[PDB]
Design an enzyme around this catalytic site. Sequence first.
Site, PDB file in Angstrom:
ATOM      1  N   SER A  17      32.804 -36.679 -21.111  1.00  0.00           N
ATOM      2  CA  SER A  17      32.389 -37.287 -22.408  1.00  0.00           C
ATOM      3  C   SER A  17      31.828 -36.384 -23.386  1.00  0.00           C
ATOM      4  O   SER A  17      30.969 -35.402 -23.145  1.00  0.00           O
ATOM      5  CB  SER A  17      31.298 -38.520 -22.326  1.00  0.00           C
ATOM      6  OG  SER A  17      30.886 -39.063 -23.510  1.00  0.00           O
ATOM      7  N   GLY A  18      32.457 -36.311 -24.500  1.00  0.00           N
ATOM      8  CA  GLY A  18      32.021 -35.643 -25.714  1.00  0.00           C
ATOM      9  C   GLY A  18      32.735 -34.181 -26.121  1.00  0.00           C
ATOM     10  O   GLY A  18      32.489 -33.326 -26.932  1.00  0.00           O
TER      11      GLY A  18
ATOM     12  N   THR B 141      39.472 -36.853 -27.996  1.00  0.00           N
ATOM     13  CA  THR B 141      40.108 -37.528 -28.965  1.00  0.00           C
ATOM     14  C   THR B 141      40.462 -36.795 -30.154  1.00  0.00           C
ATOM     15  O   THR B 141      41.457 -37.011 -30.834  1.00  0.00           O
ATOM     16  CB  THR B 141      38.919 -38.658 -29.222  1.00  0.00           C
ATOM     17  OG1 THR B 141      39.004 -39.576 -28.235  1.00  0.00           O
ATOM     18  CG2 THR B 141      39.293 -39.445 -30.413  1.00  0.00           C
TER      19      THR B 141
ATOM     20  N   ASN C 227      27.925 -38.791 -26.881  1.00  0.00           N
ATOM     21  CA  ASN C 227      28.881 -38.527 -27.951  1.00  0.00           C
ATOM     22  C   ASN C 227      28.557 -39.797 -29.162  1.00  0.00           C
ATOM     23  O   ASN C 227      28.766 -40.882 -28.741  1.00  0.00           O
ATOM     24  CB  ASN C 227      30.448 -38.977 -27.253  1.00  0.00           C
ATOM     25  CG  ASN C 227      31.474 -38.369 -28.339  1.00  0.00           C
ATOM     26  OD1 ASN C 227      31.269 -38.083 -29.473  1.00  0.00           O
ATOM     27  ND2 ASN C 227      32.523 -38.538 -27.772  1.00  0.00           N
TER      28      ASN C 227
ATOM     29  N   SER D 141      31.976 -41.845 -29.293  1.00  0.00           N
ATOM     30  CA  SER D 141      32.636 -42.092 -27.722  1.00  0.00           C
ATOM     31  C   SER D 141      33.659 -43.127 -27.766  1.00  0.00           C
ATOM     32  O   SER D 141      33.484 -44.339 -28.431  1.00  0.00           O
ATOM     33  CB  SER D 141      31.555 -42.477 -26.624  1.00  0.00           C
ATOM     34  OG  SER D 141      31.859 -42.498 -25.552  1.00  0.00           O
ATOM     35  N   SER D 142      34.857 -42.923 -27.179  1.00  0.00           N
ATOM     36  CA  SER D 142      35.803 -43.654 -27.017  1.00  0.00           C
ATOM     37  C   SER D 142      35.409 -44.560 -25.939  1.00  0.00           C
ATOM     38  O   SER D 142      35.059 -44.056 -24.708  1.00  0.00           O
ATOM     39  CB  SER D 142      37.095 -42.960 -26.596  1.00  0.00           C
ATOM     40  OG  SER D 142      37.539 -42.117 -27.614  1.00  0.00           O
TER      41      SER D 142
ATOM     42  N   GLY E  50      35.891 -40.180 -21.061  1.00  0.00           N
ATOM     43  CA  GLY E  50      35.903 -39.089 -20.160  1.00  0.00           C
ATOM     44  C   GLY E  50      34.564 -39.189 -19.124  1.00  0.00           C
ATOM     45  O   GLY E  50      33.969 -40.180 -19.308  1.00  0.00           O
TER      46      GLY E  50
ATOM     47  N   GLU F 201      31.422 -39.398 -17.284  1.00  0.00           N
ATOM     48  CA  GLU F 201      29.924 -39.676 -17.723  1.00  0.00           C
ATOM     49  C   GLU F 201      28.814 -40.097 -16.903  1.00  0.00           C
ATOM     50  O   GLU F 201      29.340 -40.674 -15.915  1.00  0.00           O
ATOM     51  CB  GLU F 201      30.172 -40.747 -19.184  1.00  0.00           C
ATOM     52  CG  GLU F 201      30.270 -42.245 -18.600  1.00  0.00           C
ATOM     53  CD  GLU F 201      30.629 -43.044 -19.877  1.00  0.00           C
ATOM     54  OE1 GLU F 201      30.762 -42.612 -20.942  1.00  0.00           O
ATOM     55  OE2 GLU F 201      30.411 -44.281 -19.761  1.00  0.00           O
TER      56      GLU F 201
HETATM   57  N1  LIG Z   1      38.347 -29.500 -32.663  1.00  0.00           N
HETATM   58  C1  LIG Z   1      37.276 -30.070 -33.108  1.00  0.00           C
HETATM   59  N2  LIG Z   1      36.883 -29.471 -34.364  1.00  0.00           N
HETATM   60  C2  LIG Z   1      35.699 -30.079 -34.780  1.00  0.00           C
HETATM   61  N3  LIG Z   1      35.010 -31.031 -34.173  1.00  0.00           N
HETATM   62  C3  LIG Z   1      35.105 -31.433 -32.935  1.00  0.00           C
HETATM   63  C4  LIG Z   1      36.403 -30.607 -32.421  1.00  0.00           C
HETATM   64  N4  LIG Z   1      36.618 -31.486 -31.214  1.00  0.00           N
HETATM   65  C5  LIG Z   1      35.447 -32.388 -31.042  1.00  0.00           C
HETATM   66  N5  LIG Z   1      34.747 -32.186 -32.040  1.00  0.00           N
HETATM   67  C6  LIG Z   1      33.351 -32.930 -32.396  1.00  0.00           C
HETATM   68  O1  LIG Z   1      32.661 -33.349 -30.990  1.00  0.00           O
HETATM   69  C7  LIG Z   1      32.579 -34.871 -31.138  1.00  0.00           C
HETATM   70  C8  LIG Z   1      33.165 -35.419 -29.996  1.00  0.00           C
HETATM   71  O2  LIG Z   1      34.592 -35.148 -29.901  1.00  0.00           O
HETATM   72  P1  LIG Z   1      35.477 -36.230 -29.133  1.00  0.00           P
HETATM   73  O3  LIG Z   1      36.950 -35.652 -29.488  1.00  0.00           O
HETATM   74  O4  LIG Z   1      35.377 -37.646 -29.522  1.00  0.00           O
HETATM   75  O5  LIG Z   1      35.230 -36.234 -27.654  1.00  0.00           O
HETATM   76  P2  LIG Z   1      36.032 -36.937 -26.528  1.00  0.00           P
HETATM   77  O6  LIG Z   1      36.265 -36.110 -25.408  1.00  0.00           O
HETATM   78  O7  LIG Z   1      34.592 -37.777 -25.837  1.00  0.00           O
HETATM   79  O8  LIG Z   1      37.110 -37.961 -26.816  1.00  0.00           O
HETATM   80  C9  LIG Z   1      33.697 -35.033 -32.229  1.00  0.00           C
HETATM   81  O9  LIG Z   1      33.242 -36.506 -33.171  1.00  0.00           O
HETATM   82  C10 LIG Z   1      33.377 -34.076 -33.420  1.00  0.00           C
HETATM   83  O10 LIG Z   1      32.209 -34.212 -34.031  1.00  0.00           O
HETATM   84  O1  VO4 Z   2      32.795 -39.651 -25.091  1.00  0.00           O
HETATM   85  V1  VO4 Z   2      34.534 -39.696 -24.856  1.00  0.00           V
HETATM   86  O2  VO4 Z   2      35.109 -39.104 -23.403  1.00  0.00           O
HETATM   87  O3  VO4 Z   2      35.443 -40.535 -25.805  1.00  0.00           O
HETATM   88  O4  VO4 Z   2      34.453 -41.641 -23.758  1.00  0.00           O
HETATM   89 MG   LIG Z   3      37.286 -39.873 -27.105  1.00  0.00          MG
END
Ligand SMILES: Nc1ncnc2c1ncn2[C@@H]1O[C@H](COP(=O)(O)OP(=O)(O)O)[C@@H](O)[C@H]1O
Ligand code: VO4
Ligand SMILES: [Mg+2]
Length: 703
Positions: free
Chosen positions: A179-180, A184, A224, A227-228, A448, A450
Amino acid sequence: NPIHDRTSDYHKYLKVKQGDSDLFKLTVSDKRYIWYNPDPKERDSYECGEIVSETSDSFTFKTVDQDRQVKKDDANQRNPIKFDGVEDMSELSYLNEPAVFHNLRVRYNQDLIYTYSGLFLVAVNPFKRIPIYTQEMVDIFKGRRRNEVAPHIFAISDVAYRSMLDDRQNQSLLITGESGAGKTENTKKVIQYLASVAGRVLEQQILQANPILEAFGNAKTTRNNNSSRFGKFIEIQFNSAGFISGASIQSYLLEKSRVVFQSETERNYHIFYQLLAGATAEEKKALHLAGPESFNYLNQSGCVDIKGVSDSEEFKITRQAMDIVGFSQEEQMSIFKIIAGILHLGNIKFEKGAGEGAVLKDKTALNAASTVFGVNPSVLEKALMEPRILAGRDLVAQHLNVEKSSSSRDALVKALYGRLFLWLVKKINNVLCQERKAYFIGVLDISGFEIFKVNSFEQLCINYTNEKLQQFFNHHMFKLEQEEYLKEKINWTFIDFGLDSQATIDLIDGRQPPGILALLDEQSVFPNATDNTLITKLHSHFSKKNAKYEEPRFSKTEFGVTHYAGQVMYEIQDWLEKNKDPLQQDLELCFKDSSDNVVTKLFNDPNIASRAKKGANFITVAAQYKEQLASLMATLETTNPHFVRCIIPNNKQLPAKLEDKVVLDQLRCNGVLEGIRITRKGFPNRIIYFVQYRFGITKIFFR
Ligand SMILES: Nc1ncnc2c1ncn2[C@@H]1O[C@H](COP(=O)(O)OP(=O)(O)O)[C@@H](O)[C@H]1O
Ligand code: VO4
Ligand SMILES: [Mg+2]
Ligand SMILES: Cc1cccc2c1C(=O)[C@]1(O)CCN(c3ccccc3)C1=N2
Ligand SMILES: [Mg+2]
């Protein structure tokens, strides 16, 4: 050509900065170095020591503060510093943990978040914006081989796209991470890239699907801020010529329980805050809205705002996306009526009557819900507290007490929200599906791994999904790869890479002997079952028997599963009810009669409203989960996979703060170093006899 031009943005933001003469001096030094632990208790905290002497079997080195000795067999040597910042770590002379981490650290310190680890990409979350995703960046990557350009999510996206064209084979991009970690965000970049390089309105709609799904399906957790709370597999569809011809979103089970409950500091789904913040003056009057503090479903966690996020601005973006995708004005208003009605339902306060049955003394929230949903408040009230059921074949009105009335109200709320979410996805898909595909590239973005202070049924299914995805990586990188070498008899000694999630997988999803989910299902149709008979059953089957299971001594309502990413303790409270996912039929009858065109579809459309039977019982959530996961895994097996391993730098959602043990734990359980070793030790490429090398039974294998 920006690639060769050292002034370019590409060079500035994607390439290692030129070292200076002081660094050259250090680079040509004859000194040798080792990575060592100042504290042998802290195996992930390393410093650099100079090797000052050696024997045939040992090194002696200076510590940061004194000399120490170490067997050469136990030594983590530091790579020559010319390797620091290397784009593909399969190039390192020394493949060990602190060396791999050091290379990622050098790159991360310069905001180089992407690094190859042999065949797959590693992405370390920057937690800040880096300007590497512009159209100009997209244009640089278009058509370039992986080795022609710097590591980037765009490059792997392009590789898959050319593979799809050249091999006439469907591809997938499997983005892993806790997670985080950045799944996404990277998913969105892949879609951006593909839509651009293969594009011809449709493209804009594909992109605009995302703010809609995130508003309704994402929320602030402690891990996060975005979070999705549902997983998805996005098929980007292409015609025979390689142009984008459409897209399809498979969504997986949504964490519906968040609608009615959130842990301290978390939020409900973003859409709730977006509406309350962003609605017009008499939008709010028409929907009887006030601020989040006024709603039970938004006032429990103590958090209504996310730092750096304007919910009113996000609401504007959500509505603009709905317009572009093609939701009508009446449809949008009904969507918002459903959101408002849910908030009102949450405000209903059941009280004890003269007897055991509950009563509703204040009907303000009931009336406001009923008005916005377009249902009869008198019918709703009866359906909540006095639902009718069969006892044998007799029809008996129940009279539920406060706790059961409240739980039935919550069941209605979660069903409305989950059905609404399905309906949104269906509506989106109807727009995006405009041509039979020739090919697809599918991008997988799961919830992800968690761990919270309290982990429930949802966490088990999430973490099991992550365990299965890691197992898919293991299968493709190590097992299938060696099975091929061995079948083609190419002089290979099999290597046990020590990554096998099978035991944990069988524990959770075993059929004979039954695993956790099977026993859950069995308990779920057992009329006398309780959360205590359930935990007792799990301990009876697994305690002191299954090596991945733990019956804790500190609790009578928890059990532990050792996952690839660490042990998780799961609380059994409400699992039977969560699995059965009940909803009083009388509530459905109430809402079937809604005057609202969207609400009526949620209750009368069998694709949204019907639930499968398994013999004489509705399909359980666990069985539904299993079906969905089996479906995904079957689709993946028909594609050529590309893996991106997202890595979270710390557990604080902060930039410029790479944490040694946080990162090393992920590198270990992800199989990163193992994945590099098979790349190096093996034979990636093979061709049926075509007309550092190996002659197989039917193929020539190469490096
Ligand atoms: N390549 C990136 N560039 C800028 N910020 C990012 C990047 N990847 C992740 N983040 C930051 O981290 C946060 C969590 O990432 P996310 O993709 O939502 O996580 P998850 O793996 O849980 O889907 C995002 O909302 C953003 O603030
Ligand atoms: O915090 V994420 O892995 O989107 O559920
Ligand atoms: Mg996500
Ligand atoms: C990717 C995926 C495939 C199959 C099922 C899935 C997922 C997922 O990633 C999920 O959609 C994320 C949450 N979840 C879930 C929620 C409540 C109860 C059970 C599961 C998931 N289920
Ligand atoms: Mg506890």
